[PDB]
């Protein structure tokens, strides 16, 4: 009785939301952008190949200066690379060999890692002794950590398999805020350019936009058919691209509050592991399970180019802050730079 | 320039040399050791086997290092994780074997059927096609008592038990009842028909009947891991 009427009320709220969205879709993005010139053909070439990892590499995150990167591999190793000279700067071993995510602090004074150990380990790179040792450990989560990004030196947001996200305090050690509402595992998250709002994409085929202070979900975005594996904002922060296992990327507008265009092709039947935008947002780079990466026109939904320099599945793909080059890391323990 | 750039480059090269030297020994140790992942249900008896391994020699993963005849082994137990395992099971594609322990006597409603796709999904998973799985059918003693009593029947939960016969290559233990002998071999074939359906000769299954108090479980893993990386080497030589 009570549960049934709550379900009916939720259903008619959803109906009202869908009707409101339909009353807003006056014209599609394709019709508006049919009158601009195409980007032509882009041919990205491989410059640097980084070698030295034993096992498969999952994650990398470019620095603020677009010069250094960090790579995490199941040999228990976080290798901090310098991309310009292909020289290894740091190599941090772990207590637990299984790592799934990594992050690089905007100030460059810290790095983060986590995984099946349920512990977010924050490593300090500016130790007085000169050796890098574990600086902070956070163990409040009850699920595997899938992604973690820094807000500043003293705060971190972590997405775990407990269907909840958490904003911590490194100095304090306790969870400052918890974000609940996702029904599945939160696989990836992306921060806004003004670090004021952030989206979390889960295995419930949905993404949610959260406010850092308020700690409440502002808007929920659906439309995907499978598990959302990667998510990234547009440079302006008013839209974002989501990639899922259904071999489709989708662009959602925050102000419009529904999808704008879907990037998909009939020749792709493999999942999407990593999505990232260019500096101007005109091109969308998506890494796929077929050992291949595709660069799409963000305004034409046309496959602009193909990058096929990997042997195993592409696990991480990132565009620098300056957008000069794109780094792709795959399971064959190789990191590559394209430009 | 060489005023300061040369010194920085030299220092960075020396550092990279030091990390390469350390990673050489780290890689030697890593290749020396073999990584095993332990999976099972909540009542599959994996804790008993872990304790038996540990006595001879909330955290989200427990690491057990033991040596059998001067060979390193890493044994990972997954805990404090949700039952949704379609995401983190991809982390174990490079393990030499997945020690799968299934409570045989636990046939909610049906642990054995639920345990079947936990093996089937692993077998047909895209990223686990190159990982061998060792099947351990625990609680052999408890299985025998239930069959001898006759209270519970396999045919109630598996309709194909009626027409199945005892394998001609079977080697029953002395003093074992003929009835329990046929039943305990039927469970193996349930995992075996799934085992040889796909893969096209890239990973195989190594069933073994073990008791929770058997001290020779190290030898079974010793011989299986001796053979898992012995068939893989034989596939590169096209001798198989």
């Amino acid at each position: 009785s009570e549960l049934d009427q709550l379900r009916q009320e939720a259903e008619q709220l959803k109906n009202q939301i869908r009707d409101a969205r339909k009353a807003c879709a006056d014209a599609t993005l394709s019709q508006i952008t049919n009158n601009i010139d195409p980007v032509g053909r882009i041919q990205m070439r491989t410059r640097r190949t980084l070698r030295g990892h034993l096992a498969k590499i999952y994650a990398m995150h470019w620095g603020t200066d677009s010069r250094l990167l960090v790579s995490a591999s199941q040999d228990g190793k976080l290798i901090i690379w310098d991309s310009y000279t292909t020289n290894k700067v740091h190599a941090i071993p772990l207590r637990s060999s299984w790592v799934m995510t990594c992050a690089y602090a905007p100030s460059g004074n810290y790095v983060a890692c986590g995984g099946l150990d349920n512990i977010c380990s924050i490593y300090n790179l500016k130790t007085r002794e000169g050796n890098v040792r574990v600086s902070r450990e956070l163990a409040g989560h009850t699920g595997y950590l899938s992604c973690c990004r820094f807000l500043d030196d003293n705060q971190i947001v972590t997405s775990s398999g407990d269907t909840t996200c958490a904003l911590w305090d490194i100095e304090t050690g306790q969870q400052t805020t918890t974000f609940t509402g996702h029904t599945g595992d939160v696989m990836s998250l992306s921060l806004a350019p003004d670090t004021r709002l952030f989206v979390s994409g889960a295995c419930d085929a949905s993404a949610k936009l959260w406010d850092v202070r308020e700690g409440m979900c502002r808007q929920t975005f659906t439309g995907h058919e499978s598990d959302i594996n990667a998510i990234c904002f547009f440079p302006n922060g008013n839209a974002f691209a989501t990639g899922s296992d259904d071999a489709t990327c989708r662009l959602f507008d925050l102000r419009a509050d529904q999808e704008l265009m879907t990037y998909s092709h009939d020749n792709i039947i493999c999942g999407i592991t990593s999505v990232s935008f260019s500096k101007s947002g005109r091109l969308l780079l998506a890494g796929y399970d077929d050992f291949n990466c595709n660069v799409w026109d963000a305004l034409k939904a046309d496959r602009a180019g193909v990058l096929a320099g990997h042997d195993n599945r592409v696990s991480c793909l990132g565009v620098t802050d300056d957008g000069m080059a794109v780094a792709t890391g795959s399971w064959d323990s190789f990191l590559k730079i394209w430009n | 320039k060489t005023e300061d750039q040369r010194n920085e480059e030299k220092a960075q090269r020396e550092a990279n040399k030091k990390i390469e030297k350390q990673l050489q020994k780290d890689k030697q140790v890593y290749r020396a050791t073999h990584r095993l992942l332990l999976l099972g249900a909540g009542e599959s008896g994996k804790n008993t086997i872990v304790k038996q391994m540990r006595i001879l020699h909330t955290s989200g993963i427990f690491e057990t290092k033991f040596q059998v005849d001067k060979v390193n082994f890493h044994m990972f137990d997954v805990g404090a994780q949700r039952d949704e395992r379609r995401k983190w099971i991809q982390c174990f594609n490079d393990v030499t074997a997945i020690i799968f322990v299934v409570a045989s006597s636990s046939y909610q409603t049906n642990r054995l059927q639920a345990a079947l796709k936990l093996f089937d999904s692993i077998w047909n998973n895209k990223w686990l096609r190159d990982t061998s799985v060792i099947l351990f059918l625990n609680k052999q003693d408890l299985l025998a008592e239930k069959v001898l009593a006759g209270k519970s029947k396999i045919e109630d939960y598996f309709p194909e038990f009626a027409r199945y016969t005892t394998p001609e290559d079977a080697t029953p233990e002395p003093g074992e009842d003929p009835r329990v002998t046929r039943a305990k071999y039927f469970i193996r074939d349930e995992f075996l028909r799934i085992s040889t359906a796909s893969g096209d000769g890239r990973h195989y299954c190594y069933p073994h009947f073990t008791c929770a108090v058997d001290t020779e479980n190290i030898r079974r893993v010793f011989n299986d891991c001796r053979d898992i990386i012995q068939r893989m080497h034989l596939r590169q030589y096209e001798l198989l």
Partner: nanobody, 128 residues
Framework: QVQLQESGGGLVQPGGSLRLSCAAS????????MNWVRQAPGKGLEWVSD????????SYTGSVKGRFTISRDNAKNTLYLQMNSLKPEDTAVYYC?????????????????????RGQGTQVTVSS
């Protein structure tokens, strides 16, 4: 929005027959293989049946093999489960589930307690 709605449940006398229907919207139904699961009162989730993308691969559990018939219609995006000769042990809440990824032979976490890709389910009660 991906939504799966089930219908056809209710109370059935022993030995009866029922037809559970699952209507799925928000995705390409022809690219996924589908499952029927059940939950006994006071017990955990137990898988019942599964059907492949084109209907070639159909498998049944031990308790319902030969008594259940699963089918799918890609034209209307509908999934049908015909239950024959119902017994009191079949009294459960039945759910229509979909595999997490398309074009995948494996199907993980369909018996998980907090699975997102399942409908609210329907009650099927066998009583005298």
């Amino acid at each position: 929005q991906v939504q799966l709605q089930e219908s056809g449940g209710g109370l059935v006398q022993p030995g009866g027959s029922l037809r559970l229907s699952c209507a799925a919207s928000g995705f390409t139904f022809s690219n996924y293989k589908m499952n029927w699961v059940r939950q006994a009162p006071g017990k955990g989730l137990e898988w019942v049946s599964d059907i492949s993308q084109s209907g070639a691969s159909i498998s049944y559990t031990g308790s319902v093999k030969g008594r259940f018939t699963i089918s799918r219609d890609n034209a209307k995006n509908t999934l049908y489960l015909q239950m024959n000769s119902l017994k009191p042990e079949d009294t459960a809440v039945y759910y229509c589930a979909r595999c997490p990824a398309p074009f995948t032979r494996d199907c993980f976490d369909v018996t998980s307690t907090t699975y997102a890709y399942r409908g609210q389910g329907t009650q099927v009660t066998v009583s005298s």
